[PDB]
Amino acid sequence: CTSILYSPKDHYFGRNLDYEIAYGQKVVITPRNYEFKFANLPAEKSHYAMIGIAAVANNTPLYCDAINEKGLGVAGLSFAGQGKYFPVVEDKKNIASFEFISYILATYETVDQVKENLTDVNISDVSFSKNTPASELHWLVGDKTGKSIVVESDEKGLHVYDNPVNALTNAPLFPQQLTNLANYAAVVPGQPNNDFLPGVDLKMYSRSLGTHHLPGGMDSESRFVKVCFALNHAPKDSDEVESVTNFFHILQSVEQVKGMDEVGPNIFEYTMYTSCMNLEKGILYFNCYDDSRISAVDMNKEDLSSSDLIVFDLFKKQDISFIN
Amino acid sequence: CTSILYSPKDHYFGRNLDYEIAYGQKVVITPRNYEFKFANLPAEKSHYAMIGIAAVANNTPLYCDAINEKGLGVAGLSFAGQGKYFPVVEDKKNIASFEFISYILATYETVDQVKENLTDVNISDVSFSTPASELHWLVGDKTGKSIVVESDEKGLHVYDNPVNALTNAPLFPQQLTNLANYAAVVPGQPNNDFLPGVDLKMYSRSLGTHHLPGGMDSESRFVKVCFALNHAPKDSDEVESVTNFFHILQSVEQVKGMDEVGPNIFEYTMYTSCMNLEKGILYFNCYDDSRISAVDMNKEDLSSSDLIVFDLFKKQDISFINHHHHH
Amino acid sequence: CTSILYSPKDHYFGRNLDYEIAYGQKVVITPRNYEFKFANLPAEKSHYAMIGIAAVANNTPLYCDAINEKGLGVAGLSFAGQGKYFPVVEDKKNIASFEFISYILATYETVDQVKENLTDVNISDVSFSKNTPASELHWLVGDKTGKSIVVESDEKGLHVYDNPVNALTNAPLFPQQLTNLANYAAVVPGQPNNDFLPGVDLKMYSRSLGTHHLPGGMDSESRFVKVCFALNHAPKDSDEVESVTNFFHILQSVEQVKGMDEVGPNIFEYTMYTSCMNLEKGILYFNCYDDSRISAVDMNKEDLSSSDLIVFDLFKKQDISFINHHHHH
Amino acid sequence: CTSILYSPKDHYFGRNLDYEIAYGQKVVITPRNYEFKFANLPAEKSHYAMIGIAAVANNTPLYCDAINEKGLGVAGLSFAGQGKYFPVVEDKKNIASFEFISYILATYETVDQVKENLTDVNISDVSFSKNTPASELHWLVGDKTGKSIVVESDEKGLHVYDNPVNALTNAPLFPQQLTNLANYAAVVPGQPNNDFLPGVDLKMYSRSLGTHHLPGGMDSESRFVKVCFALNHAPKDSDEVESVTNFFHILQSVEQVKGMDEVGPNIFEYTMYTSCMNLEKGILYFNCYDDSRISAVDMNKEDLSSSDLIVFDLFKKQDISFIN
Numbered sequence A, D: 001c002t003s004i005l006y007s008p009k010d011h012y013f014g015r016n017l018d019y020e021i022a023y024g025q026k027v028v029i030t031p032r033n034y035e036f037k038f039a040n041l042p043a044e045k046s047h048y049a050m051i052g053i054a055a056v057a058n059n060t061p062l063y064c065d066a067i068n069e070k071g072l073g074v075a076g077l078s079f080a081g082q083g084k085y086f087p088v089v090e091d092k093k094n095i096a097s098f099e100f101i102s103y104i105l106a107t108y109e110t111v112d113q114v115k116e117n118l119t120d121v122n123i124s125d126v127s128f129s130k131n132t133p134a135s136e137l138h139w140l141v142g143d144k145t146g147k148s149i150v151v152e153s154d155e156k157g158l159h160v161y162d163n164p165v166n167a168l169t170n171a172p173l174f175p176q177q178l179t180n181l182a183n184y185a186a187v188v189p190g191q192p193n194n195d196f197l198p199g200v201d202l203k204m205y206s207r208s209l210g211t212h213h214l215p216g217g218m219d220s221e222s223r224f225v226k227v228c229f230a231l232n233h234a235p236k237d238s239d240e241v242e243s244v245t246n247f248f249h250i251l252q253s254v255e256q257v258k259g260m261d262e263v264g265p266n267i268f269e270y271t272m273y274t275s276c277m278n279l280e281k282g283i284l285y286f287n288c289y290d291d292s293r294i295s296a297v298d299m300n301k302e303d304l305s306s307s308d309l310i311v312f313d314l315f316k317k318q319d320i321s322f323i324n
Numbered sequence B: 001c002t003s004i005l006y007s008p009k010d011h012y013f014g015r016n017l018d019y020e021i022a023y024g025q026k027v028v029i030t031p032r033n034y035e036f037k038f039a040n041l042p043a044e045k046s047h048y049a050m051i052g053i054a055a056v057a058n059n060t061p062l063y064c065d066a067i068n069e070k071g072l073g074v075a076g077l078s079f080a081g082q083g084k085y086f087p088v089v090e091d092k093k094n095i096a097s098f099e100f101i102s103y104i105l106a107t108y109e110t111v112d113q114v115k116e117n118l119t120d121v122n123i124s125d126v127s128f129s130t131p132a133s134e135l136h137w138l139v140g141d142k143t144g145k146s147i148v149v150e151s152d153e154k155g156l157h158v159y160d161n162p163v164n165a166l167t168n169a170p171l172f173p174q175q176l177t178n179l180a181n182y183a184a185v186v187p188g189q190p191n192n193d194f195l196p197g198v199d200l201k202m203y204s205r206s207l208g209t210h211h212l213p214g215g216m217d218s219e220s221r222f223v224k225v226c227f228a229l230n231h232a233p234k235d236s237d238e239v240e241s242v243t244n245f246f247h248i249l250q251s252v253e254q255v256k257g258m259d260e261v262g263p264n265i266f267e268y269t270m271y272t273s274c275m276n277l278e279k280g281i282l283y284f285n286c287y288d289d290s291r292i293s294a295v296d297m298n299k300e301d302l303s304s305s306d307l308i309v310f311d312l313f314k315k316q317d318i319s320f321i322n323h324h325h326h327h
Numbered sequence C: 001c002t003s004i005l006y007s008p009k010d011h012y013f014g015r016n017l018d019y020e021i022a023y024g025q026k027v028v029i030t031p032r033n034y035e036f037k038f039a040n041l042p043a044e045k046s047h048y049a050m051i052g053i054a055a056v057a058n059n060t061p062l063y064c065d066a067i068n069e070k071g072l073g074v075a076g077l078s079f080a081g082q083g084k085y086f087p088v089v090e091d092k093k094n095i096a097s098f099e100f101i102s103y104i105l106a107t108y109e110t111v112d113q114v115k116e117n118l119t120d121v122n123i124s125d126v127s128f129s130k131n132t133p134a135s136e137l138h139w140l141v142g143d144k145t146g147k148s149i150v151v152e153s154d155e156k157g158l159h160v161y162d163n164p165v166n167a168l169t170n171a172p173l174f175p176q177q178l179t180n181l182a183n184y185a186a187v188v189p190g191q192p193n194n195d196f197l198p199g200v201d202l203k204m205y206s207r208s209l210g211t212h213h214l215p216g217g218m219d220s221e222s223r224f225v226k227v228c229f230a231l232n233h234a235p236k237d238s239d240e241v242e243s244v245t246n247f248f249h250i251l252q253s254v255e256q257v258k259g260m261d262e263v264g265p266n267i268f269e270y271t272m273y274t275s276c277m278n279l280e281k282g283i284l285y286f287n288c289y290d291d292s293r294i295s296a297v298d299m300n301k302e303d304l305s306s307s308d309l310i311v312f313d314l315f316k317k318q319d320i321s322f323i324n325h326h327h328h329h
């Protein structure tokens, strides 16, 4: 439910997926010569390869978030109550919602290139199957340049926003998310100067009183504000393992523990998995609620010119290293 | 920095330790026949065994948090600016702050019995050499109940802890009172008694947590962790319990960069310890290695007389999946 | 600024005006036969009478807030950084922003009528004079039905929204204001049931812990959320004096004391005046920062068929009632 | 429910009184030779004159807030659930809670005087009469030096605190009120500097986003924080009428409107009256919920050598000035 683009040296793209129902997700590599059959676009027999997290149904990857081999990344996040899809129209490039990640990563390589080519796009109301109605999504798109954009189809059509904070959660519309950001302009990671009650000595009784109003709620605006802050103040100039460890810490600070986000009677949205994808090197790191150890899958260990989905387990059991 | 007692079925006692300076911590078992040289109390050559996280100086275990073989846990958290120690007094049991954890765990079994035996105690200003840091303590046991032990300018206090958690400043009664400020928080959606007769755009799940504290400061972590701990799953086996415990503490984790205690110097979560009181096992991980390790105290010669030390801080232990070793 | 429509029995429309400098506002009655010379619309030599707070420039009322004799009210509030006006166009009915309140109150009777007639409207970039550039505004329109609308011209054009909370402040765009209200759905005036830490007895050490996260800042969102709450929970079924009294207290809940809203180097926005207009009776009640005693001007005690502005002072000195004067009269 | 000491030039001492029911309060001058019968202290047949707001019962002024002719002020505020009174004892000077304001103003002139002479005081559990059991109170005391103390009798006995912010509300204990102030140390009247997300240009869409976390609730803590802020930033170097005007506005910023503070089924705590007492001049200014016009009673226009209470009406009907 929280997606970030983290640029300490290399560039890392990933997300927490928080929900109360699973969708058979696995780690799925789609090689260069798997044939995408799009609903209303020309089928691509050869295309960029990609690795990400996906459900697989009737030999089709239904990606939740992924990156391709040229350093482009796309994540889809619930947009329930905000999104609107539109019927196929005879003068636009019609991408169905479930195939947006596939189509973008198969075809383009940079955010700037995605921007120039979404100008004719319509996100259509086409669903994958009758027993799989399209879900309401909006998308974060980042690349190796450290810049990202937000893609939102709503009542007023398709919108592409520049994303100055390289993060995204759920509702409301993206310009309202950014507006809300300014309500926390006074937050600081250390201690503020006392211009609150000038001339009075306040006992600064705790460290980091400058974050006393930083949101810790499980709702979409709270996670958006906190993760923007965590991401902006995270370390830079780190090697691979340090950068990947920091990426998980960032997303861990807005994780949803079971019991805190109630969505029905004893039904809870919680952080099902976290994914971390190196854009330069094509490596997908991940963990999940039940297993905190970080696993990794490298796209280049496989034959990118093959033509079948390569599939690994996402959800794992707790992998405790016993010491004595 | 954040310590909890979690009672889903078994009982788990542990803490995040958040700071900017490390103190050579390690896992440390103290067996029954290690000789405790107490600064102003009788030497204890035979005592309960215990396991925790500690620094070892001059062959002495300086514990941050630990449990003993009877199922009593004690954790020490920073109390800077709030605590006061006092000179050794003629009429009281004088425990030095740096040895409070060792003494309480070597001597007692239940939190109830720690309460009875604290009434004549004075926490002294004696240091190790290394001056004594300002701490207060959370004490908990297998009854699922816990106490707060604070020495401040008004003397030694012991408080029943109704939320089984503790962070840093201010004094514990103020922490508890501040909780009532969050009485409207719920994990789901509230009923709209805010603007009766108006249909609110409930645009997000869990709008009931919109005012839940997420700051890195001491009151914010206390309010969040109490809520996380109170709403965590119950009636669960060992591994699931341990998994939920670590998630509770991760929700009040301090990521590098968010808590600035100096010029480009940051307080962050250095390690997370989780200790099963029934089974004497210490699970832990640290900032650089997210994989949980375990040490079982009962798989050692608890009759020995030397300290058994293991490593705490480990490198990231990644599990590479598509190694193509084709075994 | 904060504007509200309040409906205990009669219907009361009005606002706080919060700012750092005054514009010569007075109480101004525009009678039925004052000739409105609009910028790109036909003049209206006969029209509804209206009373409100306005600046007078070249014998022209420049209303900040007013009501007309038929019980319609319009208030203009700062929309700086969100509003946009558009060049005059032939495909549309062009109303300049400085004349929106005058034109609507001269011409229309009800919020419904206003809605129907805004469907072809353009808020133009025309200014009263080359030397009085047009400020950025949005408007609250309410009437005796107890319903109101919000009128906003922004980047994407003109918009008219039903206002379910009968209040308005400044930025952001009105849909975003309503969204932000949901962030406070847990607020109650009394004490909440403890679903926070079930099983823990939390001492409710203060009354009204349910309002502990109610916003008190001077910013636009804070004042919007607080005044919506104040207005929703205010008493009903009151008679005249009682209703006016509660109206002023509602707007008082979000007033700006000097010193708390710094808008420039030692420059402060503060509540300059508060206006309360009975839609049914044509009576304008007011006080101001320096005088808390309420004053009243009845439109209907005046000759409404005439054609010159009838003008009364708005800002007054503090009007203190000295009790033990011992004039022993 | 909120009391302040305001020091723009002269010194002003006063309070909002918020509650759900009135106790027949009036403006009451007690002249120098009205005889006080104290429960456990010698009668004072002559003493300082005082003016304030009081319930009168059996020809006794039961003050809620008042000032004396030497420029000392005391205000009693509800302390329910925190305060404790103790049985009369021989070892101490026993002041009953209902008489605390009268005894202090009759006997002393400065806050320093009060501080010294409280070192042997017990606030007793004695009640004024069987029909009026003692309510739980704590007190703000201020004088013409511009400084104030807080007097609190709780579980651990009597406490006197210097008050750095010259304000007081209800629970919790005063050192906890002070500690909570530091949680708002980043609040500013204007725009903060963006140390929140460095490198990002936040759109500052509203004036005064620095007050976005200033409390506006009706609870005791919220009103305390906001009134400290209003009082700290209020104008200075003003003459009489401007100072009174700002004094009422300071207290209006934490006014309790009917409907916002529910204390039972359709029972509301609201701001019943506001008093503003000039310490130098002995003038009591007031208004009330039903009448926003300010009224004034001047102590020094009465014969302060008399011995009967001089009473004036406090609650008044809305006094509207009809212009035409």
Ligand SMILES: *CC(=O)CC[C@@H](C)[C@H]1CC[C@H]2[C@@H]3CC[C@@H]4C[C@H](O)CC[C@]4(C)[C@H]3C[C@H](O)[C@]12C
Pocket (backbone or CB within 6 Å): B001, B002, B016, B017, B018, B019, B023, B055, B062, B063, B064, B076, B077, B078, B079, B097, B098, B127, B128, B130, B131, B132, B133, B134, B168
């Ligand atoms: C997160 C937080 O509260 C920081 C606490 C941290 C700085 C404390 C916690 C335990 C302390 C050590 C206990 C043992 C010993 C005691 C001695 O008096 C000083 C030296 C030791 C190692 C303490 C150091 C430090 O204050 C520790 C780690």
Ligand SMILES: *CC(=O)CC[C@@H](C)[C@H]1CC[C@H]2[C@@H]3CC[C@@H]4C[C@H](O)CC[C@]4(C)[C@H]3C[C@H](O)[C@]12C
Pocket (backbone or CB within 6 Å): C001, C002, C016, C017, C018, C019, C023, C055, C062, C063, C064, C076, C077, C078, C079, C097, C098, C128, C132, C133, C134, C135, C136, C170
């Ligand atoms: C509290 C707040 O929102 C401030 C609003 C305030 C500064 C506005 C509100 C009405 C404006 C006047 C309308 C009439 C006229 C219009 C003309 O374009 C410019 C001059 C006038 C007097 C406006 C001045 C100012 O923007 C006013 C008062």
Ligand SMILES: *CC(=O)CC[C@@H](C)[C@H]1CC[C@H]2[C@@H]3CC[C@@H]4C[C@H](O)CC[C@]4(C)[C@H]3C[C@H](O)[C@]12C
Pocket (backbone or CB within 6 Å): D001, D002, D016, D017, D018, D019, D023, D055, D062, D063, D064, D076, D077, D078, D079, D097, D098, D128, D132, D133, D134, D135, D136, D170
């Ligand atoms: C806003 C707030 O804190 C409410 C306080 C309010 C209800 C208190 C304040 C002063 C109290 C009276 C003092 C005099 C007398 C004392 C006696 O023990 C009981 C009766 C009196 C009149 C008190 C009533 C009430 O508690 C008052 C008004």
Ligand code: NI
Pocket (backbone or CB within 6 Å): C325, C327
């Ligand atoms: Ni006279």
